[PDB]
Design a protein around this motif. Structure first.
Motif, PDB file in Angstrom:
ATOM      1  N   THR A  45      35.247  26.141  51.692  1.00  0.00           N
ATOM      2  CA  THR A  45      36.129  27.732  51.438  1.00  0.00           C
ATOM      3  C   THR A  45      36.806  27.933  52.871  1.00  0.00           C
ATOM      4  OG1 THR A  45      34.533  27.833  49.713  1.00  0.00           O
ATOM      5  CG2 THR A  45      35.777  29.691  50.591  1.00  0.00           C
ATOM      6  N   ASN A  46      36.130  27.846  54.133  1.00  0.00           N
ATOM      7  CA  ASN A  46      36.317  28.459  55.014  1.00  0.00           C
ATOM      8  C   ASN A  46      37.381  27.728  56.158  1.00  0.00           C
ATOM      9  OD1 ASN A  46      34.704  30.514  54.524  1.00  0.00           O
ATOM     10  ND2 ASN A  46      32.972  29.657  55.487  1.00  0.00           N
ATOM     11  N   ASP A 107      44.076  30.846  47.439  1.00  0.00           N
ATOM     12  CA  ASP A 107      42.927  30.437  47.211  1.00  0.00           C
ATOM     13  C   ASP A 107      41.906  31.539  46.552  1.00  0.00           C
ATOM     14  OD1 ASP A 107      42.804  27.479  47.698  1.00  0.00           O
ATOM     15  OD2 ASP A 107      42.137  27.995  49.790  1.00  0.00           O
ATOM     16  N   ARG A 108      42.156  32.696  47.319  1.00  0.00           N
ATOM     17  CA  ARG A 108      41.503  34.027  46.480  1.00  0.00           C
ATOM     18  C   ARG A 108      42.195  34.323  45.222  1.00  0.00           C
ATOM     19  NH1 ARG A 108      41.850  37.595  52.073  1.00  0.00           N
ATOM     20  NH2 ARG A 108      40.101  36.792  53.107  1.00  0.00           N
ATOM     21  N   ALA A 111      40.489  31.834  42.849  1.00  0.00           N
ATOM     22  CA  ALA A 111      38.845  31.999  42.813  1.00  0.00           C
ATOM     23  C   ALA A 111      38.668  33.256  41.978  1.00  0.00           C
ATOM     24  CB  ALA A 111      38.474  32.215  44.151  1.00  0.00           C
ATOM     25  N   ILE A 112      39.520  34.093  41.971  1.00  0.00           N
ATOM     26  CA  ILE A 112      39.258  35.378  41.014  1.00  0.00           C
ATOM     27  C   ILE A 112      39.706  35.317  39.847  1.00  0.00           C
ATOM     28  CG2 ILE A 112      39.447  37.934  41.068  1.00  0.00           C
ATOM     29  CD1 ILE A 112      37.452  36.921  43.220  1.00  0.00           C
ATOM     30  N   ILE A 113      40.975  34.829  39.713  1.00  0.00           N
ATOM     31  CA  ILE A 113      41.471  34.906  38.394  1.00  0.00           C
ATOM     32  C   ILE A 113      41.177  33.698  37.255  1.00  0.00           C
ATOM     33  CG2 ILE A 113      43.879  34.948  36.818  1.00  0.00           C
ATOM     34  CD1 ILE A 113      43.041  37.502  38.351  1.00  0.00           C
ATOM     35  N   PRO A 115      37.906  31.270  37.154  1.00  0.00           N
ATOM     36  CA  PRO A 115      36.776  31.158  38.089  1.00  0.00           C
ATOM     37  C   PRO A 115      36.259  29.691  37.511  1.00  0.00           C
ATOM     38  CG  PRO A 115      36.351  32.725  36.721  1.00  0.00           C
ATOM     39  CD  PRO A 115      38.001  32.784  36.545  1.00  0.00           C
ATOM     40  N   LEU A 116      36.341  29.356  36.209  1.00  0.00           N
ATOM     41  CA  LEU A 116      35.582  28.365  35.513  1.00  0.00           C
ATOM     42  C   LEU A 116      36.320  26.898  36.228  1.00  0.00           C
ATOM     43  CD1 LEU A 116      34.340  29.092  32.200  1.00  0.00           C
ATOM     44  CD2 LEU A 116      33.517  29.350  34.326  1.00  0.00           C
ATOM     45  N   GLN A 117      37.259  27.209  36.627  1.00  0.00           N
ATOM     46  CA  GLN A 117      38.156  25.731  37.386  1.00  0.00           C
ATOM     47  C   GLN A 117      37.683  25.335  38.530  1.00  0.00           C
ATOM     48  OE1 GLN A 117      39.815  25.570  34.161  1.00  0.00           O
ATOM     49  NE2 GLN A 117      40.988  24.388  35.398  1.00  0.00           N
ATOM     50  N   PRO A 118      37.373  24.219  38.884  1.00  0.00           N
ATOM     51  CA  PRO A 118      36.683  23.828  40.067  1.00  0.00           C
ATOM     52  C   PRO A 118      37.430  23.985  41.136  1.00  0.00           C
ATOM     53  CG  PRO A 118      37.332  21.816  38.874  1.00  0.00           C
ATOM     54  CD  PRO A 118      37.516  22.917  38.034  1.00  0.00           C
ATOM     55  N   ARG A 119      36.808  24.337  42.421  1.00  0.00           N
ATOM     56  CA  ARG A 119      37.707  24.466  43.507  1.00  0.00           C
ATOM     57  C   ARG A 119      38.140  23.203  44.206  1.00  0.00           C
ATOM     58  NH1 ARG A 119      40.008  24.983  47.937  1.00  0.00           N
ATOM     59  NH2 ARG A 119      39.415  25.945  49.900  1.00  0.00           N
ATOM     60  N   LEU A 201      40.431  43.497  39.419  1.00  0.00           N
ATOM     61  CA  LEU A 201      39.306  44.077  40.126  1.00  0.00           C
ATOM     62  C   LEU A 201      39.010  45.513  39.611  1.00  0.00           C
ATOM     63  CD1 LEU A 201      38.150  42.262  43.292  1.00  0.00           C
ATOM     64  CD2 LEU A 201      37.705  41.694  40.968  1.00  0.00           C
ATOM     65  N   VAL A 210      37.697  46.058  48.381  1.00  0.00           N
ATOM     66  CA  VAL A 210      38.681  44.876  48.320  1.00  0.00           C
ATOM     67  C   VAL A 210      39.972  44.951  48.075  1.00  0.00           C
ATOM     68  CG1 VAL A 210      38.685  42.579  46.971  1.00  0.00           C
ATOM     69  CG2 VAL A 210      36.588  43.140  47.782  1.00  0.00           C
TER      70      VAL A 210
END
Lengths: 284, 38, 216, 322, 115, 11
Positions: A45-46, A107-108, A111-113, A115-119, A201, A210
């Motif tokens: 992630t970072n 990536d944000r 990740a938010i929209i 979420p169930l898909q893998p990174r 959000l 946020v």
């Protein structure tokens, strides 16, 4: 030779540049140390965060200091090789910083929209970082290749001697293309992604914090990167403005405004997350 | 039923005292200490 | 010599295993659990040692495990379900005699050390029997707190009072002490439980991903 | 009749073991560093077992994988998938030919490495907790229905059954003479069994909670048990009583694995506080700390030559210490 | 060995073989012809005390860690209270699942109360 | 080369 300034204006500009370069380099290398040195933050992630931190540190170490020491008295002090290197590398650092910001927004959003898909995998992240740096170097190459150093009575100047044409097509097309590739596209991408994420959000106070953070990021990006491109697209519309001290006052003002965008991200990371607050507390 | 028979069968054991078992443990620990890499 | 054949077999192993990491991350594990009186077997037939059920919704695959082949004691193998996404807890809401055992099981699940970060989706099954039983016991001889309760439904609002009292009894111990609880009302026949599980898992993964991206 | 047994065990006690260790050279400080690090598993590693040649080891994970590792070159020799994703135990044959696994599926699977499923044993009603090889012909298992069993692989049916426990059996360990074995269960009791007859010879009751680990001494006349009450206890088969205890006042976590060293001088115990402790077996004082895992350590192993100690935790990493 | 002995209308449960000041204690009944049902529980310090709703306001539980004993005081009896009573300890300290189980290794033999 | 009074700004 008219580009000379008295002591007090130089002192004011030196303080106003020293503040932002000290804050930028200290915050960026501290954030890079916090992510790379605690053995639990080294995560897929970072990676884009440490890429953005390195790009911003390299952007604020060279491109601000050397341009200030060139814009104080309009004289070159280093030589032809450093003129070539300065027209090659820090512009690529600027491009890599902007595209790293776009990748972080991407990536944000995913990740938010969704979420169930893998990174994305580690190797895909490393390939995206490599493509970002290669595209930055390829976009900044023609300015550094054609750079040259010329002498004049009491002047030595590093300039960009573009090939001559009766209608000036090459540099016009290059400047319009680099304006499109810097400003208009990732502003649209970041605006759409952060608009969708903020609409979704909007423990409600953390979500609203946020959304306020993303509003601040988009507004500061647009407001701090507009007049830089306006000034660099200026002299193909009215080129008689470049023969006075007012244009170097304008150049110094827009250079401070453009390079003030470096300090914001460590302040945001210290404001939001508590683990980064503990990192700044342990680092100091 | 089964627990009573188990206790009655296990009650008749030859329990050697603590000193002989401790001395045997000391002897086995001291005799093989030259082949311990840890 | 012999070291070259070891390196060649090693690189074939790390390739295929990587493909396994492409699929093990793409599926979510749910643990279904309840009592014998609860209709947890009627739930798993609708989406369809250890019984397993695979169902796909919105191009996302879920693999949920109805486990029982062991004795009454469950304090040792329940540590095996540490990395699951959610625990589907099914409660028969028409039996007040067995409801205290369900509440104690919920307490032991919620306050466990290795289950203190895994959230629970709660289903209150068999509510047509609850309506036909309340309208026709009195749901206060077992709980001496129903006589003073106000609701925070076709002819009588007493069934709403009973349903919200039971879900408030379930939610008080959840909010008394990271992980959330998602209660839903379900009937004997219902073809929308997969959508509810999908939406709750979406919310759980979104709330988890909000923290790892350093956004609090 | 139990009061007479307690009175006899009190009358057989002369002096403590700690008071007899006044004149002995102490071990001193022991520091160990991680030499190799094995990283190929997805989910949590649950068990392991060292080989007889002290080079090849086997590891079982909770995603349904069983991987044979070379400890020297960190090379993955075999990576066998499983029918059931949930396993709790593994063992390695003394001749190097066979490997075994078991778990929540109530089946014991035996694989040949000369890789296909050579044998499936299905006679239990509870989950398998431990399994060991006597030879490549007989296998001892312990289940979650308070039963231990000795099976013949060739016939595939149960030969003898040991039924003496009231709680679920968690661990077993065989003697170096291959004629007796001990088992610890979830009733704070450890039992010694004989494989020829099939009856419980002796019963020890010293702990206060579920016993999670048990292993024989190198001599074959004593054993140490770890439990959930943050204590380790050493019993002897001749003294018939709790011989020694090891505990600390700053620990409130259980013990997951227990092993000895080559000479019996050291005792290594893995804890739920993300670390392993190294105790002295005679002075009853803590002497070493091994801390390298980000989750709870779940399995521990000591080589047959006493040259390496391997730990495995829930952070999907297996590490080797020397 | 852990030992729980019941006597008994004030019912007494005496414990031995373990440290009494570390475990949460339970009282569990068993009616003739019915399964095990949870009645009451008390924490390590006695600050948290809980009952079944059928016995609330009618029973009381206390523990004495100085002598390591557990008392139950019960009044206003009914014919539904004729049962066998056990005192149970849930296994892990500083926390505890299977106090209501068919074969549990940490509970006594119980006492019969017939009203 | 262009003029002796230009500024020559850089990026």
């Amino acid at each position: 030779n008219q580009f000379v300034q008295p002591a007090w204006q130089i002192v004011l500009w030196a303080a106003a540049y020293t503040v932002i370069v000290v804050t930028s380099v200290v915050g960026n290398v501290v954030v890079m140390w916090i992510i790379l040195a605690h053995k639990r933050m080294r995560t897929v992630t970072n990676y884009f965060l440490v890429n953005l931190a390195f790009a911003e540190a390299s952007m604020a170490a060279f491109n601000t200091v050397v341009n200030f020491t060139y814009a104080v008295h309009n004289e070159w002090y280093y030589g032809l090789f450093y003129c070539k290197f300065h027209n090659f590398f820090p512009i690529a650092a600027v491009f890599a910083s902007i595209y790293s910001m776009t990748a972080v927004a991407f990536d944000r959003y995913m990740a938010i929209i969704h979420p169930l898909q893998p990174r994305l995998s580690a190797t895909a992240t490393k390939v995206v970082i490599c493509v970002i740096w290669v595209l930055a170097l390829l976009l900044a190459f023609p300015q550094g290749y054609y750079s040259t150093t010329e002498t004049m009575p009491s002047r030595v100047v590093c300039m960009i001697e573009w090939p001559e044409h009766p209608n000036k097509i090459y540099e016009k097309v290059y400047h319009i293309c680099v304006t499109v590739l810097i400003y208009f596209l990732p502003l649209l991408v970041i605006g759409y992604a952060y608009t969708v994420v903020g609409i979704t959000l909007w423990q409600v106070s953390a979500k609203r914090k946020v959304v306020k953070m993303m509003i601040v990021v988009v507004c500061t990006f647009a407001i701090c990167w507009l007049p830089f491109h306006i000034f660099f697209l200026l002299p193909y519309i009215n080129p008689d403005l470049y023969l006075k001290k007012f244009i170097q006052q304008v150049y110094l003002a827009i250079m401070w405004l453009a390079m003030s965008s470096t300090m914001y991200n460590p302040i945001i990371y210290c404001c939001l997350n508590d683990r980064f607050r503990l990192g700044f507390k342990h680092a100091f | 039923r089964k627990l009573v028979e188990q206790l009655k069968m296990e009650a008749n054991i030859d329990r050697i005292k603590v000193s002989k078992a401790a001395a045997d443990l000391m002897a086995y620990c001291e005799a093989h200490a030259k082949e311990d890499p840890l | 010599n012999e070291e070259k054949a070891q390196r060649e077999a090693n690189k074939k192993i790390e390739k295929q295993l990587q493909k396994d990491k492409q699929v093990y991350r793409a599926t979510h594990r749910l643990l279904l659990l309840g009592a014998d009186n609860s209709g947890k077997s009627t739930i798993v037939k609708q989406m369809r040692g250890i019984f397993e059920t695979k169902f796909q919704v919105d191009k996302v695959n879920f693999h949920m495990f109805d486990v029982g082949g062991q004795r009454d004691e469950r304090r040792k193998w329940i540590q095996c379900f540490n990395d699951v996404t959610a625990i589907i807890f099914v409660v028969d809401s028409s039996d007040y005699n067995r409801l205290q055992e369900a509440l104690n099981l919920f307490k032991s699940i919620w306050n466990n050390r290795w289950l203190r970060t895994i959230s629970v989706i709660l289903f209150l099954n068999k509510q047509d029997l609850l309506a036909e039983k309340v309208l026709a016991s009195k749901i206060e001889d077992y709980f001496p707190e129903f006589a003073r309760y106000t609701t925070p439904p076709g002819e009588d609002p007493r069934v709403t009072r009973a349903k919200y009292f039971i879900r408030d009894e379930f939610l008080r111990i959840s909010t008394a002490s990271r992980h959330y609880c998602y209660p839903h009302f379900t009937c004997a026949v219902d073809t929308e439980n997969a959508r509810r599980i999908f939406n709750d898992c979406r919310d759980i993964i979104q709330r988890m991903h909000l923290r790892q991206y350093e956004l609090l | 009749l139990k009061n007479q047994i307690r009175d006899a065990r009190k009358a057989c006690a002369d002096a403590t073991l700690s008071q007899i260790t006044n004149n002995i050279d102490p071990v001193g400080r022991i520091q160990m560093r991680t030499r190799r690090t094995l990283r190929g598993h997805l989910a949590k590693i649950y068990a392991m077992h060292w080989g007889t040649d002290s080079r090849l080891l086997v590891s079982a994970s909770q995603d349904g994988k069983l991987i044979i590792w070379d400890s020297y070159t960190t090379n993955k020799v075999h990576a066998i998938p499983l029918r059931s994703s949930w396993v709790m135990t593994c063992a390695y044959a003394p001749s190097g030919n066979y490997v075994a696994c078991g778990g929540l599926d109530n089946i014991c699977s035996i694989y040949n490495l000369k890789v296909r499923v050579s044998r499936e044993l299905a006679g239990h009603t509870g989950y398998l907790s431990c399994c060991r090889f006597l030879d490549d012909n007989q296998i001892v298992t312990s289940s979650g229905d308070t039963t231990c069993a000795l099976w013949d692989i060739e016939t595939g049916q149960q030969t003898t059954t040991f039924t003496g426990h009231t709680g679920d059996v968690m661990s077993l360990s065989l003697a170096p003479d291959t004629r007796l074995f001990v088992s610890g269960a979830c009733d704070a009791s450890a039992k010694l069994w004989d494989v020829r007859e099939g009856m419980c010879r002796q019963t020890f009751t010293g702990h206060e909670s579920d016993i999670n680990a048990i292993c024989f001494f190198p001599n074959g006349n004593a054993f140490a048990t770890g439990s959930d009450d943050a204590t380790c206890r050493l019993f002897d088969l001749r003294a018939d009583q709790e011989l020694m205890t090891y505990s600390h006042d700053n620990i409130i976590c259980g013990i997951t694995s227990v092993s000895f060293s080559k000479s019996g001088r050291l005792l290594l115990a893995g804890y739920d506080d993300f670390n392993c402790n190294v105790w002295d077996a005679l002075k009853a004082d803590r002497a070493g700390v091994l801390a390298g895992h980000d989750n709870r350590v779940s399995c521990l192993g000591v080589t047959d030559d006493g040259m390496a100690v391997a730990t495995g935790s829930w952070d999907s990493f297996l590490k080797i210490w020397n | 060995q852990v030992q729980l002995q019941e006597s008994g209308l004030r019912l007494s449960c005496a414990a031995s073989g373990f440290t009494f000041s570390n475990y949460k204690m339970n009282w569990v009944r068993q009616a003739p012809g019915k399964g095990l049902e949870w009645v009451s529980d008390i924490s390590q310090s006695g600050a948290s005390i809980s009952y079944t709703g059928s016995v609330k306001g009618r029973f009381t539980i206390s523990r004495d860690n100085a002598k390591n004993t557990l008392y139950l005081q019960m009044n206003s009896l009914k014919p539904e209270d004729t049962a066998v009573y056990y005192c149970a300890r849930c296994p892990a300290p500083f926390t505890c699942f299977d106090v209501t189980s068919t074969t549990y290794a940490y509970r006594g033999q119980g006492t019969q109360v017939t009203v | 080369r262009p003029k002796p009074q230009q500024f020559f700004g850089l990026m």
